[PDB]
Design an enzyme around this catalytic site. Structure first.
Site, PDB file in Angstrom:
ATOM      1  N   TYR B   7       0.832  -1.198   0.000  1.00 12.29           N
ATOM      2  CA  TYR B   7       0.000   0.000   0.000  1.00 12.29           C
ATOM      3  C   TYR B   7       0.873   1.257   0.000  1.00 12.29           C
ATOM      4  O   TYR B   7       2.105   1.165  -0.036  1.00 12.29           O
ATOM      5  CB  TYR B   7      -0.961  -0.031   1.215  1.00 12.29           C
ATOM      6  CG  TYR B   7      -2.091   0.982   1.175  1.00 12.29           C
ATOM      7  CD1 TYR B   7      -3.066   0.939   0.174  1.00 12.29           C
ATOM      8  CD2 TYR B   7      -2.212   1.952   2.158  1.00 12.29           C
ATOM      9  CE1 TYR B   7      -4.095   1.862   0.138  1.00 12.29           C
ATOM     10  CE2 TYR B   7      -3.235   2.877   2.132  1.00 12.29           C
ATOM     11  CZ  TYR B   7      -4.179   2.824   1.123  1.00 12.29           C
ATOM     12  OH  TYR B   7      -5.201   3.742   1.112  1.00 12.29           O
ATOM     13  N   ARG B  13      -6.743   2.665   3.467  1.00  8.99           N
ATOM     14  CA  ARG B  13      -7.482   1.416   3.280  1.00  8.99           C
ATOM     15  C   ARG B  13      -6.735   0.160   3.731  1.00  8.99           C
ATOM     16  O   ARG B  13      -7.314  -0.912   3.847  1.00  8.99           O
ATOM     17  CB  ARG B  13      -7.979   1.309   1.835  1.00  8.99           C
ATOM     18  CG  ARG B  13      -8.966   2.440   1.460  1.00  8.99           C
ATOM     19  CD  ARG B  13      -9.533   2.296   0.045  1.00  8.99           C
ATOM     20  NE  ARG B  13     -10.790   3.050  -0.086  1.00  8.99           N
ATOM     21  CZ  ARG B  13     -10.910   4.259  -0.640  1.00  8.99           C
ATOM     22  NH1 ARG B  13      -9.862   4.882  -1.189  1.00  8.99           N
ATOM     23  NH2 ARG B  13     -12.102   4.841  -0.676  1.00  8.99           N
ATOM     24  N   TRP B 103     -10.943  12.107  -1.951  1.00  8.90           N
ATOM     25  CA  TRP B 103      -9.559  12.002  -1.484  1.00  8.90           C
ATOM     26  C   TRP B 103      -8.524  12.454  -2.502  1.00  8.90           C
ATOM     27  O   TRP B 103      -7.452  12.913  -2.138  1.00  8.90           O
ATOM     28  CB  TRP B 103      -9.238  10.569  -1.046  1.00  8.90           C
ATOM     29  CG  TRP B 103     -10.133  10.059   0.064  1.00  8.90           C
ATOM     30  CD1 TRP B 103     -11.138   9.140  -0.047  1.00  8.90           C
ATOM     31  CD2 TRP B 103     -10.109  10.466   1.440  1.00  8.90           C
ATOM     32  NE1 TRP B 103     -11.733   8.939   1.187  1.00  8.90           N
ATOM     33  CE2 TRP B 103     -11.120   9.742   2.110  1.00  8.90           C
ATOM     34  CE3 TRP B 103      -9.326  11.374   2.172  1.00  8.90           C
ATOM     35  CZ2 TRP B 103     -11.371   9.896   3.480  1.00  8.90           C
ATOM     36  CZ3 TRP B 103      -9.569  11.520   3.531  1.00  8.90           C
ATOM     37  CH2 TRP B 103     -10.595  10.789   4.169  1.00  8.90           C
TER      38      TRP B 103
END
Ligand SMILES: N[C@@H](CCC(=O)N[C@@H](CS)C(=O)NCC(=O)O)C(=O)O
Ligand SMILES: N[C@@H](CCC(=O)N[C@@H](CS)C(=O)NCC(=O)O)C(=O)O
Ligand SMILES: c1ccc(-c2ncc(-c3cc[nH]n3)s2)cc1
Ligand SMILES: [Mg+2]
Lengths: 198, 198
Positions: B7, B13, B103
């Protein structure tokens, strides 16, 4: 167990639960409400959204939470722990895209603009991702049908309402849709369900 | 198994997966990338999105699909299939809301304005629902902590950055955050993890 499904008079987000009820041969009340009766129901719900599923006096919510609940320990769930992960992931991928549409937008021009963009610019890439992912396999996950195939069929049916040429270059995805539509319990539901646009 | 999480350097997330690994005392490689390593990695991903988890070379996607998979057969998942449905339902409700935030919006004024709108109208409404849903009970679902409690603490932590006074009228929800933060495995992780705004 007495089941009562409440949603609008649409396939919409309730359709996945309806296909699951059909496949497993579970009787339930398919409660469809008119918008006029919505606000009065909405006001009483823990989270104010539909669909909701009442099971023996206990109000469940979130379409996919409910779908996952109904398929647990059935042949619609993945065949391995890892397969249930892929089932979940394909469903959330389909869901993420479907959730981008401004379904409730009241300004028609803004709604159309948005729908057209998502369908023209984004949908074709999702089809490409799904097509590669499926490959020459029979079902999206594993060697038998799962509720992800059901959700694929459902999501794609609605997208095709707005963009009929969506799958012209994806015959393998058309085949998958048709495979799902051929399953006896699904075929029966497709023939008998209320015919709505969405 | 040999787990590798990929990530960006941020909670985002992937954090729910990180809490689950920590709480279940499951070792994994916490691989974080910078933008520069993104285009190459993205190209290799069936759906071009992160996070992803590799389990003994097999690639998984969708953060909630992964989190659910990791909690399988553990008390964190929910104690009954019905509780597991409630856990899933809360999780999607929270995710649905977090997904509303732009976002990636590059126009700073538009980003500020949309955030404000969501934090001024939508967030307090959702907080009233979450608060009454929890009641004076210990955890969101059942008798023990579930990954829905984890997800609540994670989503709220990020929301509190933008609207610090969000829970000022929701002491039960603040108490929930604290109960989750004090779980030893979580307390440890929160202290060890790289500091990032999001
Ligand atoms: N992620 C949720 C979405 C639920 C949802 O937003 N449903 C819409 C109808 S598709 C709704 O409740 N709209 C009426 C309202 O918000 O008042 C789910 O899958 O159940
Ligand atoms: N619903 C998905 C969302 C995944 C997602 O949108 N990931 C973002 C990072 S927060 C991403 O890859 N966006 C950048 C891009 O797609 O290029 C999940 O929870 O895994
Ligand atoms: C997967 C599949 C279908 C859908 C929806 N279809 C019609 C929806 C609607 C129209 C007015 N309100 N809501 S929502 C969503 C996710
Ligand atoms: Mg979702």
């Amino acid at each position: 167990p007495n089941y009562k499904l409440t949603y609008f008079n649409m396939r919409g987000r309730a359709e996945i639960i309806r296909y699951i009820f059909a496949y497993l041969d579970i009787q339930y009340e398919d409660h469809r409400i008119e918008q006029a009766d919505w606000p009065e129901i909405k006001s009483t719900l823990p989270f104010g959204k539909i669909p909701i599923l009442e099971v023996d006096g206990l109000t469940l919510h979130q379409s996919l939470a409910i779908a996952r609940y109904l398929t647990k320990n059935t042949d619609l769930a993945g065949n391995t722990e890892m397969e249930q992960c892929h089932v979940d992931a394909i469903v959330d991928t389909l869901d993420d895209f479907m959730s981008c549409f401004p379904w409730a937008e009241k300004k028609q021009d803004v709604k159309e603009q948005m729908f057209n963009e998502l369908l023209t610019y984004n949908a074709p890439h999702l089809m490409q991702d799904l097509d590669t992912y499926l490959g020459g396999r029979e079902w999206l996950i594993g060697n038998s049908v799962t509720w992800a195939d059901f959700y694929w069929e459902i999501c794609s049916t609605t997208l095709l309402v707005f963009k009929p040429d969506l799958l012209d270059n994806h015959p393998r995805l058309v085949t998958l849709r048709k495979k799902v539509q051929a399953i006896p319990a699904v075929a029966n539901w497709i023939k008998r369900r209320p015919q709505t646009k969405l």
